[PDB]
Design a binder for this molecule. Structure first.
Ligand SMILES: Nc1nc2c(ncn2[C@@H]2O[C@H](COP(=O)(O)OP(=O)(O)OP(=O)(O)O)[C@@H](O)[C@H]2O)c(=O)[nH]1
Lengths: 54, 74, 217, 84, 847, 73
């Protein structure tokens, strides 16, 4: 709500080996763009890499 | 392979059928065969003499059939 | 990325009778995704806007689970079909000749490698192929399709920043890509072997590694 | 290998104007409605000329295929893909 | 002729000679839901009629999505005409004029433009998806425009390769699709002669990706060509429905022999196709050459080395061959221009079939008066000059022939809209290359050059010095209403004329585009949706005007209405203070406005039929039922004007002198509206007392019309005014798991879900919901992002509903940049729209 | 039957059962020997030529045929 209104107002008015966390994106206010519904792939497809049993 | 000739549009239809020896025949169609041998109801002879002679149930060899015309509108 | 070209800013456009914020009805904010999806509607001065690929029909592929089922089988994941015609009469004299049967009648409907052969249609490249040209070992990125996925929610911030940074260089490579220049085939090692100063053999890789280490030293 | 080209050309002639000359020397010019593998022609709007030269009008005609001497087809059929 | 063209299976001389015989021409439009396979078909046919133009192995050559944005978006945006000569099953050749129409619900105007100049419709339906939203909408539109309807169930391979249904269940799915189409047709049409069934040859089965296209007759002909002694026409009559084959008696019965017996369609058609596909995709190395030997297909060695998809395409192409089933369908069940001319003149000609010119047009005689109707305008890539496109309903158009072009406002008494022009060139339009010709007879489609100057949307091209009593064809009646509204303004005000010229050009391109200039000097574009306006602005900025254009926020068009009867009977007098009118305003009965707009009632009816209709349908007495004066701002506006003046109180003969002016005043007043200069909807205006000055020098003209408009406004303002939102109808297809996510996305935008239901034979679900148009911008993107792309939605305008708040309430305080609560949405929608229009800040409620 | 594919496109005169002569361009033939002759003219005996065009004659009345002119351009 407050971040909602603030976004509306804004729109209309050394060797660093590790990346700085300030460069992160996806720090969003809309709950639809944070809690994205996860694809289930009919319960038979799985994401690569992660352990299958998990 | 002898496909039946298409006369279903000429079904139940008053027709004039001319012949080999200059003969000509009139009536209504009731059926055919792949040899187009033709059955006629209410057949009328009307030979070249000019007098119409009626017979009725007749069946004609297709080998002598020259030309089929539907007098009534199809 | 960084700004492609210095231009006007969101704080640089003065109030006009056009863009007056008192004439604007706000229901839901115009997110950046809305401006990417329709670059010519939600955006002023669109340049270098590559139109995104619109919807692709949903591939309703039923992944098999048990190989002891028929290849063509009404899977429970498929919603049932609720049951409920100028046909000729039986007495109509139409008979099918003696030597006429459906085209492939002896051929079985499905073989023991039909379910697997269909699942290969939707396999990612190169598993949807059956022939091709060999690639170099270093030209095969095994994780390139890992970081092209969505940023994984719940991972620490370092992981997500790594994902985005990998995507940045991927996009830069795909964008700054230049055509390979035309040239005339000249090979260094063939030239070396042509001269009398070099000779060929066949050694273990470790031995050659030791030789290269000592030679560099 | 089964059905000859001229029968195919006659099939193409359906819908055009055709003139038909049967063994009795009778000329039938009219719109060809249908044709079969045999020369059985169902053809319409006939301007029919007899041997003596008398001309008549007859709206529907069906000619037995065995009893055609020759059939004159419209010239645009010379460009049929089947004639190449 | 004399134009370098791709080599064809036929020769263009044959094509030119076919155009003269109107009985061998088929004017067909391809329509269907989005991405239902309508475009390969065209190349899936261009390839079969163009040996050198082939589809790429890994990429489909759309060949009719010739546009830039069409090629990147992969979405049909504009109709593309294709003229090809296609052979029949019997070897006969017909000339086909095919209209490839876009399937997106936003671009329905292109579909109506195609439907106007077409005699038949081929509806494409995905075999897996089934009957979707646009399929129903296009069925309704086609049966309403009196077009022959045929169905092509495309993408049947999805039943085999994706869903992997058993052949019997694939048959059930196909029968269910056909039954759904039949039910829709019977719903939107009264006469029964449009029964769709593969037994009648109406329905074809196809898979354009793999070059499969067969009817029952074509497959029976494949059998006959293999085994000579069978009659394929009688065979085809037993290949559908609950008719089973008995191999012992070699006869087809209506009862299954014993048990485990399959229907004829499964045994003879579906099972062989299943086996072909299964062999190709599973046993290509093991047991493919043997089956190919059985079917008589011999593939060369380098041909068997192909990938599975090109190999399947090639095998099916060899087995099936040309698309003769499609041509059989369209020849048997789509009228030729000669036969279909009469319904076309009956429906789309203002003069009616009975007119003398109507008769000559209904004959479709190419030696008669010229009568060409153009509905599409195609711009050359330079974007300077356009080319009109339409069919020649009568006569014959020639290159270099001067013509008289009639606009949309041209009447037989106002002959000022007509303009003489000179035809420059004529092209027989094909998808990509234009084949220039010298003349085009009746019944054909022609691309005309030189008549683009005086036309905006549609035209009727006739001959000068003849055809004096030549009227026009009715302007296109579209499926939807343009609601989404955006404003445009050049970045540099110096180049305003350039943007105006570009606006004229885009108005020419898009049939349903409405560009208007508001009172405040604001240029406004009306569109159907986000994609529609996106592509409109893409064309405007890049194609027609090379300047930079600013775009305002999207907004919708509102409508104004009432909810009770006016408290005090309003009155208004002329400046002469002699003529006085008294009116009251009350809301119309439920469901009457829709009856009025949909031409269920017309004021052209005699007073008797009007009265009886109102009496039997809405409980009106004869006095009021026959008392109707006008029917809203247009001839079919959703408002009614009724006179309750008693014969004793006011002399009716004198009232007739001012009837013709009160009607105009009421029409203009409803056209403007007092709240925010929006249309008035669903309002009944009753006149109670009309004091008329006897002297005609005092009444009539510019004295009584403004009084009528003012009294209309004041009467409207007494009964509680309300605003009206356009409501969108959204259909969403999504898997079972993402249904809840769809609900969550909808709940945030004032959405109200009507129904979710499984798609029979598919693992997906259809969610149908209602969403306000204004609370819909980015809804598609929200739904496709929250669901990771697994849910897709198409939205179309449905109806008008009242905004929750009360527009006339000064107690509400609104901040400039915050979303408002529903209790006072109407107040914001009203004042902000007024500010946008440039009017005062608030209304002045008075008498 | 190469004995007549060799004769295609050649200007051919064919003799009919009733004595009619048909001169034209040989286009096509079938097993029943129905002939396709384009820009065909008929010669009857008193000399007279009647231009007819594309003639499809049934095999019944065809008797004898002979090359008269080389294929045109
Ligand atoms: N599985 C399958 N996919 C097909 C078939 N035919 C086409 N497609 C694909 O489905 C999509 C449909 O694209 P088009 O055929 O161009 O779409 P359209 O029907 O013209 O509709 P619009 O996008 O509105 O123009 C593309 O990805 C095609 O390659 C088919 O028979 N089977």
């Amino acid at each position: 709500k407050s971040k909602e209104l603030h976004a509306i107002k804004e729109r209309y008015l050394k060797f660093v080996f590790e990346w700085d966390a300030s460069e992160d994106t996806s720090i969003d206010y809309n709950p639809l763009y944070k809690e994205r519904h996860q694809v289930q792939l009919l319960g038979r497809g799985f994401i690569a890499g992660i352990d299958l049993k998990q | 392979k002898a496909h039946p000739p298409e006369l279903k549009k000429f079904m139940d239809k008053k027709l004039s059928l001319k012949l080999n020896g200059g003969r000509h025949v009139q009536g209504i169609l009731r059926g055919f065969d792949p040899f187009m041998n033709l059955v006629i109801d209410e057949c009328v002879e009307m030979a070249t003499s000019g007098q119409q002679n009626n017979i009725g149930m007749v069946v004609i060899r297709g080998n002598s059939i020259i030309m089929l015309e539907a007098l009534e509108r199809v | 990325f960084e700004p492609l070209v210095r231009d006007i800013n969101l704080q640089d456009e003065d109030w006009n009778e056009f863009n007056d914020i008192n004439k604007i009805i706000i229901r839901q904010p115009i997110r950046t995704e809305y401006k990417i999806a329709f670059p010519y509607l939600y955006n002023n001065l669109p340049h270098h806007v590559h139109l995104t690929w619109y919807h692709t029909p949903n591939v309703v592929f039923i992944k098999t689970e048990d190989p002891d089922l028929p290849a063509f089988y009404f899977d429970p994941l498929i919603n049932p079909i609720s049951h409920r015609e100028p046909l000729p009469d039986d007495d109509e004299e139409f008979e099918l000749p003696e030597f006429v049967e459906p085209f492939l009648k002896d051929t079985p409907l499905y073989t023991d490698n039909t379910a697997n052969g269909i699942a290969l249609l939707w396999a990612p490249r190169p598993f949807n192929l059956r022939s091709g040209r060999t690639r170099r070992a270093l030209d095969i990125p095994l994780v390139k399709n890992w970081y092209r996925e969505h940023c994984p929610a719940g991972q620490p911030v370092k992981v997500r920043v790594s994902y985005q940074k990998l995507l940045k260089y991927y996009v830069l490579n795909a964008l700054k890509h230049r055509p390979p220049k035309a040239q005339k085939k000249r090979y260094l090692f063939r030239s070396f072997k042509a001269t009398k100063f070099f000779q060929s053999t066949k050694l273990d890789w470790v031995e050659v590694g030791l030789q290269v280490c000592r030679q560099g030293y | 290998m089964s059905i000859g080209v001229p029968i195919k050309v006659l099939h193409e002639a359906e819908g055009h104007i055709v003139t038909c000359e049967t063994n009795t020397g009778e000329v039938y010019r009219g719109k060809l409605i249908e044709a079969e593998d045999n020369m059985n022609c169902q053809m319409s709007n006939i301007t029919v000329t007899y041997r003596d030269g008398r001309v008549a009008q007859l709206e529907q005609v069906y000619i037995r295929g065995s009893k055609i001497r020759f059939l004159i087809l419209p010239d645009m059929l010379k460009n049929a893909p089947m004639l190449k | 002729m004399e134009q370098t063209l791709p080599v064809t299976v036929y020769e263009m001389d044959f094509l030119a000679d076919l155009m003269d015989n109107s009985e061998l021409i088929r004017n067909v439009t391809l329509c269907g839901h989005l991405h239902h396979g309508k475009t390969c078909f065209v190349d899936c046919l261009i390839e079969q009629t163009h040996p050198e133009i082939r589809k790429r192995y890994d990429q489909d050559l759309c060949y009719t999505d010739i546009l830039f944005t069409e090629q990147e978006r992969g979405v049909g945006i504009k109709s593309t005409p294709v003229t090809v000569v296609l052979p029949d099953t019997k070897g006969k050749s017909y000339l086909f004029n095919i209209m490839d129409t876009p399937g997106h619900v936003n671009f329905s105007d292109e579909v109506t433009a195609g439907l106007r100049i077409s005699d038949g419709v081929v509806l494409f339906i995905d075999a897996a998806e089934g009957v979707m939203l646009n399929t129903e909408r296009l069925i309704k539109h086609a049966v309403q425009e009196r077009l022959a309807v045929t169905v092509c169930i495309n993408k049947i391979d999805r039943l085999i390769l994706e869903l992997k249904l058993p052949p019997t269940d694939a048959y059930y799915k196909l029968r269910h699709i056909v039954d759904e189409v039949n039910g829709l047709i019977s719903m939107y049409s009264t006469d029964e002669n449009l029964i769709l069934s593969p037994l009648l040859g109406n329905v074809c089965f196809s898979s354009s990706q793999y070059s499969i296209c067969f009817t029952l007759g074509s497959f029976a002909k494949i059998y006959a060509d293999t085994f000579g002694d069978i009659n394929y026409q009688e065979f085809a009559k037993r290949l559908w429905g609950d008719i089973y084959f008995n191999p012992k008696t070699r006869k087809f019965t209506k009862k299954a022999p014993t048990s485990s017996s399959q229907r004829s369609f499964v045994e003879f058609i579906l099972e062989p196709l299943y086996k072909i596909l299964a062999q190709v995709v599973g046993d290509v190395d093991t047991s493919l050459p043997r089956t190919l030997d059985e079917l008589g297909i011999h593939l060369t060695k380098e041909e068997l080395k192909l990938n599975i998809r090109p190999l399947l395409r090639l095998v099916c192409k060899k087995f099936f061959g040309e698309f003769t089933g499609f041509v059989d369908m369209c020849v048997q069940h789509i009228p030729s221009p000669k036969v279909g001319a009469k319904p076309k003149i009956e429906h789309t000609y203002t003069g009616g079939v009975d007119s003398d010119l109507g008769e000559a047009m209904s004959d479709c005689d190419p030696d008669g008066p010229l009568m060409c109707h153009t509905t599409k305008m195609y711009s050359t890539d330079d974007g300077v000059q356009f080319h009109a496109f339409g069919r020649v309903l009568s006569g014959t158009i020639h290159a270099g022939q001067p013509v008289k072009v009639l606009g949309e406002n041209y009447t037989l008494e106002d002959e000022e809209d007509s303009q003489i022009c000179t035809v420059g060139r004529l092209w027989i339009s094909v998808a990509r290359y234009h084949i220039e010709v010298n003349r085009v007879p009746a019944g054909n489609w022609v691309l005309i050059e030189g008549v683009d100057q005086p036309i905006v949307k549609t035209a009727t091209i006739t001959e000068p010095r003849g055809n004096e009593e030549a009227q026009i064809f009715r302007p296109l009646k579209f499926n939807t209403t343009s609601v989404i509204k955006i404003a445009v303004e050049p970045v540099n005000p110096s180049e305003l004329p350039k943007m105006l010229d570009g606006l004229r050009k885009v108005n020419k391109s898009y049939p349903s585009l409405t560009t208007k200039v508001e009172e405040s000097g604001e240029h406004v574009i009306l569109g159907t949706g986000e994609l529609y306006l996106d592509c409109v602005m893409h064309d405007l900025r890049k194609m027609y005007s090379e300047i930079d254009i600013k775009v305002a926020d999207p907004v919708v068009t509102f409508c104004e209405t009432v909810v009770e009867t006016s408290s005090l009977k309003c009155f208004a007098e002329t400046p002469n203070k002699k003529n006085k009118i008294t009116m009251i305003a009350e809301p119309l009965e439920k469901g009457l406005a829709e009856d009025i707009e949909n031409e269920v009632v017309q004021i052209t009816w005699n007073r008797k039929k009007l009265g009886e209709f109102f009496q039997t349908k809405y409980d009106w007495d004869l006095l009021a039922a026959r008392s109707i004066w006008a029917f809203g701002p247009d001839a079919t506006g959703p408002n009614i004007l009724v006179d309750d003046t008693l014969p004793s109180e006011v002399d009716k003969a004198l009232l007739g002198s001012v009837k013709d002016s009160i009607v105009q005043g009421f029409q203009w007043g409803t056209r403007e509206g007092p709240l925010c200069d929006e249309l008035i909807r669903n309002v009944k205006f009753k006149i109670l007392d009309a004091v008329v000055a006897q002297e005609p020098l005092h009444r009539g003209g510019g004295q009584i019309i403004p009084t009528a408009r003012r009294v209309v406004y004041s009467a409207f303002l007494m009964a509680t005014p309300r605003l009206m939102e356009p409501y969108y109808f959204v259909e969403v297809q999504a898997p079972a798991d993402c249904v809840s996510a769809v609900y969550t996305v909808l709940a945030r935008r004032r959405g109200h879900v009507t129904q979710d239901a499984p798609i029979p034979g598919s693992p997906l679900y259809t969610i149908k919901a209602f969403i306000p148009a204004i609370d819909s911008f980015g809804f598609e993107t929200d739904l496709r992002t929250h669901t990771q792309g697994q849910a897709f939605s198409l939205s179309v305008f449905h109806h008008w509903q009242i905004v929750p708040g009360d527009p006339l309430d000064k107690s509400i305080v609104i901040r400039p940049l915050e979303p408002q609560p529903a209790p006072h949405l109407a107040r914001e929608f009203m004042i902000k729209t007024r500010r946008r229009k440039g009017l005062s800040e608030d209304v002045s409620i008075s008498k | 039957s190469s004995k007549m594919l060799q004769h295609i496109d050649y200007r051919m005169r064919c003799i009919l059962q009733d004595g009619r002569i048909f001169i034209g361009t040989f286009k096509a033939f079938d097993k029943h020997m129905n002939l396709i002759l384009c820009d065909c003219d008929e010669f009857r005996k008193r000399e007279e030529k009647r231009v007819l065009g594309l003639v499809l004659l049934r095999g019944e009345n065809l008797v004898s045929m002979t090359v008269e002119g080389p294929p045109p351009k």
